[PDB]
């Protein structure tokens, strides 16, 4: 699927059964999501944004399924407003930018 | 020019003679840049990020030239670390996302 930018790039995800929705963000390095319970092992990590230093919960080889495409790699969890798909993932779904 | 996401999407800009460099960001709504002096009329506007409420200086029909492509539309100026090309612009250079 090829998508235009006339309005916010939001597609559906799957993180362990759970259908979801996020931003295909080419300005992010990490991928962070909605507080859902992951079967797995975590490593405390920290992010920020308007106030800053919010504590997140890094997961390591999580298989995210995005817009039909399987893809594994790290995903970060914690109190975020929006699911955001960093570089890490677009990188791996073959995703490229076209003008 | 078509660009991959294996590493931060940074291209060169032109804002009134001045060669520059920014992020082709599909997760931003506005376009904000480096404190350079624009011939034009401004409207005080406000943004934020890690601490938040930083005051910026909105410009209105500024012709940004990006990666060979002419394109006009608003550009925002103020103490930012990085030049960032919002939706507003990618929108207008015909820019699309491809996987």
Q: What are the domain boundaries of chain A? A: 1-99
What DSSP string runs through B29-96? SS-EE-----SS-EEEEEE-SSS--EEEEEESS-EEEETTEEEES-EEESS-SSEEE-HHHHTTTT-E
H helices, E strands: number in chain A: 1, 11
Whole-angstrom Cα distance, residue A78 to residue B70? 40
- Diameter of chain A measured on Cα atoms: 40
Whole-angstrom Cα distance, residue B24 to residue B95? 10
A97 with B69: Cβ contact below 8 A? no
User: Structure tokens of A67?
Assistant: 């817009």
Q: What is the resolution of this structure in A?
A: 2.7
On whether the A1-99 domain is CATH 2.40.70.10, my answer is yes
Suggest the residue from A21, A94, A99 to mutate for an interface test with chain B (most B CBs closer than 10 A): A99
Backbone angles phi, psi at B88, to 5 degrees: -30, -45
Whole-angstrom Cα distance, residue B94 to residue B99? 16
Angle, CA B59 vertex, CA B72 and CA B21 arms, to 5°? 65
Give the containing element (helix H, strand E) for A83: strand A83-85
Nearest-by-CA chain B residue for A52: B50
B81 at A interface, C-beta within 8 A:
no
Task: Identify how the structure was determined.
Answer: X-ray
B68 at A interface, C-beta within 8 A:
no
Taking one residue from A and the other from B, the number of pairs with CB-CB distance under 8 angstroms is 114
B45 at A interface, C-beta within 8 A:
no
């Amino acid at each position: 699927p090829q998508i235009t930018l006339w309005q916010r790039p939001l597609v559906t995800i799957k993180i362990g059964g759970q259908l979801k929705e996020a931003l295909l963000d080419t300005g992010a390095d990490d991928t962070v999501l909605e507080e859902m319970s992951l079967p797995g092992r975590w490593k405390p990590k920290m992010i920020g944004g308007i106030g800053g230093f919010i504590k997140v919960r890094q997961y390591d080889q999580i298989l995210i399924e995005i817009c039909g495409h399987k893809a594994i790699g790290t995903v970060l969890v914690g109190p975020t407003p929006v699911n955001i798909i960093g570089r890490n993932l677009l990188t791996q779904i073959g995703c490229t930018l076209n003008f």
